[model samples]
Each structure stands twice: as C-alpha cells, then as structure tokens.
Target: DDLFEELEEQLLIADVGVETTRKIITNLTEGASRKQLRDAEALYGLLKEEMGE
Candidate 1:
C-alpha cells in the first residue's frame, strides 16, 4: 500500500498513458483501498470485468 504501489507502477511499465494512467491508478487505488485488495489480482479483475462488458 504505502510501501509500494505495484498496480500503478505496473500500468506505467505497460505504457498505459500520462493522464489516463494517473486516472486509472487513482481509480484503482480507490477500489483496492476500499475493497482491501492486496495485489495485482484485484486490478486484473477490474480490468477483465470491464473488458467483458
């Protein structure tokens, strides 16, 4: 969490976007923090869920 933001960093590593990346990371952080997610799995689930729509 405060130690390392792996999901945000991973999006950066994947060349997501500048503004888009920040928005994504912030939104993801909100979900993760709210849901008590521990790793990339939660983020991945979010993405996959969105993709299926």
Candidate 2:
C-alpha cells in the first residue's frame, strides 16, 4: 500500500510516464505471483529484467 505507492512515486520522478509505469507495475505483480516471491529483494531483480527487455 504505502510501499507500493513509493515505487510508483519513484517511477514518476524518473519520468517513466503513466502507461509505462502501469505496465511495469503489472509485470512486477505478475512476476512476483508466478515465482511466489517471499522477498522483495528477488522482485527487485525482476524489475531490472523488465526494464532491459
């Protein structure tokens, strides 16, 4: 919730734009669910992967 918001906030600060930011948010949640991630550290890597692709 609050932390979830921070990610979006940071993305906006980076000028990711609305559509792209939502795109990233969707993938982050989807990847986390697929992997059943128990830690944010692992999800952090997935984000880098998302950006690279």
Candidate 3:
C-alpha cells in the first residue's frame, strides 16, 4: 500500500499524468489479481519483471 502510493506519487511528479499513471497502476493491479500476489514483495517483484519486459 505504502510502496504503491509512493510509486504513484513519483510517477505523477515525473509527468506520467493521471490517466497513464492509472493505466499502469491498473495493469499492475490486474496482473497482481491474476497472478494472486500474496504480499507487497510479490507485487514488487511482478512490477520489476513486467517493467523489464
């Protein structure tokens, strides 16, 4: 929760904009749901892998 909030703030400050930021966050959230992420660590790992892709 806190990490995601920080990420959202950083993305917005970088001018990623609300819509695109939401899209990215939404994708991450959906991916987490689909993959059944059990914790922040798992989510972080998923974010890293997906962003690398």
Candidate 4:
C-alpha cells in the first residue's frame, strides 16, 4: 500500500538511516501481519508500540 511508501519516505526524511529504517519497516510489517492489523490506523498504533521496544 501507499502507506508503506509514505512511512518509508518519512522515516528517511527523519534521518532514521537505511538499515534502521528497513528494520523498523520490516518489523512493522511483521507485527501487522502477526497481530492481524487491518488498516493504516491499526498500523500506526502498532508502529508506536514497535518503536517503544
């Protein structure tokens, strides 16, 4: 989805660095699948939780 594109771009803009950004995005994707997240809203919260890890 375009949501991932935006998240990727924003993360890059934030200077997250390529490897870390990839790890974060990968984790977010995995967490979303494992947790059955259904939409951008759900993903947003999941990302927040992931970042707190």
Candidate 5:
C-alpha cells in the first residue's frame, strides 16, 4: 500500500510509463511482504530484479 503509492510518485516524477510503473510496484510490494526486508540492499535487489536493472 505505502510502497506502491511512493513508487507511483517516483515513477510519475521520473516519467516512467504507467504500465511499467505498475508492474514494478506490484513486484516490489509483493517482495516487501514475502521477503521481510532487512536492509537497503535487500530492497534494492528486489527492485533491481523487477526493473531489470
């Protein structure tokens, strides 16, 4: 909920496509729940995988 909203804001600011942003947000939010984030690195990895970064 919170992370989706936040990433939505960032995606909008960064001019990312709406569909692309939604896909990334969905992946992150799921990872946030399933992975139990421990640190910035963990979260970064999730996002990187989702965004193919």
Candidate 6:
C-alpha cells in the first residue's frame, strides 16, 4: 500500500539526488491516478516505464 516514501528513500540511496528523486516521485504519484490502469498488479509495469524515463 505504501510505495512513494520507500521509493524516495531507495532512489536517494542510489545517489539519485534529492531534487531529481522528488520530481520523479511527484510525477509518478500524479500519474498513478491519471493513468488508465489503477490495478495495483499493473504498477510494476508502469514503474518500469517511469524508472526508465
């Protein structure tokens, strides 16, 4: 159920930097609801795409 904070921490650990990581996290959260697939199972796929970009 909780993903955003965990991801933020992880990306920060990866040395993604605070600014960039939060930017992506914000977009990802907004995109979550705007996206067609609300199904949690499909999150992995979208997450891959999000991470890719």
lDDT of 3 at 50: 100
Q: What is the TM-score of each candidate against the true structure?
A: 0.35, 0.37, 0.38, 0.37, 0.36, 0.35
Query: Which tens-of-lDDT digit does each residue in 1-53 have in candidate 1?
Result: 94379877887777756777889899998987867655567889989999999
> What RMSD, rounded to one decimal, does every model reach?
18.6, 18.7, 18.6, 18.9, 18.7, 19.0
Question: Against the unseen true structure, what C-alpha lDDT does each candidate score?
Answer: 0.80, 0.84, 0.85, 0.85, 0.84, 0.81
Candidate 1: stretches off by over 4 Å: 1-16, 37-53
The positional error of residue 29 in candidate 4, measured at the CA in angstroms, is 0.5
> What stretches of model 5 exceed 4 Å from their correct place?
1-16, 37-53
lDDT per residue (tens digit) for residues 1-53 in model 2? 99999998997777757777899999998988867755666788989899999
Give the alpha carbon lDDT tens digit for every residue of 1-53 in model 5: 99999999997877767777899999999989766656667888889999995
RMSD in angstroms between candidate 3 and the native structure over all alpha carbons: 18.6
Off by over 4 Å in 2: 1-16, 37-53
How far in Å is the alpha carbon of 16 misplaced in model 5? 7.7
**In model 2, what lDDT does residue 13 have?**
75
Backbone clashes under 3 angstroms, per model? 0, 0, 0, 0, 0, 0
Backbone clashes in model 4, listed as residue pairs: none
RMSD in angstroms between candidate 6 and the native structure over all alpha carbons: 19.0
How far is 24's C-alpha from truth in model 3 (Å)? Answer: 0.2
Count of clashes in candidate 6: 0
TM-score head-to-head 5 vs 6, winner: 5
Backbone clash total, candidate 5: 0
